[PDB]
Paper text:
Despite these low concentrations, proteins have a great technological relevance in winemaking as some of them, the grape pathogenesis-related (PR) proteins, can aggregate to form a visible haze. Among the grape PR-proteins, the thaumatin-like proteins (TLPs) and chitinases can undergo changes in structural integrity, particularly under certain conditions such as when wines are exposed to elevated temperatures during storage or transportation. In this paper the crystal structure and some physico-chemical parameters relevant for the haze formation mechanism of three isoforms of TLPs isolated from grape juice were determined.
Despite sharing the same sequence, the two VVTL1 isoforms, I and H2 exhibited differences in their chromatographic behavior, a feature that allowed their separation and that also indicated that they possess some differences in physical properties. The physical differences between these two isoforms of the protein were also observed during crystallography. The initial solution for this structure was deposited in the Protein Data Bank as 4H8T. This initial structure included data to 2.0∶Å and an overall R value of 0.224. This domain comprises 11 β-strands forming a β-sandwich of two β-sheets. Domain II consists of a long α-helix (α5) and four α-helical segments (α1 to α4), and is stabilized by four disulfide bonds (residues 146–196, 154–164, 168–177, 178–183). Importantly, disulfide bond 89–95 connects domain I to III, while disulfide bond 146–196 connects domain I to II. The comparison of the two structures performed with the algorithm for protein structure alignment and comparison named TM-align tool indicated that the two proteins have a root mean square deviation (RMSD) of 0.78 Å, with a TM-score of 0.98, indicating that the proteins belong to the same fold (thaumatin), confirming results previously obtained with CATH.
Author numbering: 25 to 222
Amino acid sequence: ATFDILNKCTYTVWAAASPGGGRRLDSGQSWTITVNPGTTNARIWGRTSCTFDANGRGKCETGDCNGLLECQGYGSPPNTLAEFALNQPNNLDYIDISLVDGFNIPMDFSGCRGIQCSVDINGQCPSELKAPGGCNNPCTVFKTNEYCCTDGPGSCGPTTYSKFFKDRCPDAYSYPQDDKTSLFTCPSGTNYKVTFCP
């Protein structure tokens, strides 16, 4: 599938993708990439307040991926995530927005359907979760089963912290096993758009 990633934010967002790399997107700028069929574990995100040298090495305030402009792996929370797995059994793509790795930039992720998390989550973030330039999931900050779901299927459920996210962005994953209301499919052959600050 092709993904068009567009920055509508008034500030620069350094877009990233696993797999795909990364690009500086000033306001209004787009980057289009191809992710091949069968790819799983994939994600697109944006990074805020980056500094990079002439070789693309540096650091971002949110979503940094091992200090590279061109990501070769996942970023550091908090980062709003567009997650996808392509061309899975029965020709289904599995898509979602996740806040399980935190929020940093409001996002729209569209394909056969539009999913959005566009609220001022940073401005309303609980003091327990606040991070420079974003809002961490409780699981990232507090390493307990109640937030992280490590103890098996059904061992965790919504918490006052997951609900902070879920009340505001009902369609995104708010805790690791938030599947029934956050996991979507599109028929395979769909193409996608990720928009920052929709």
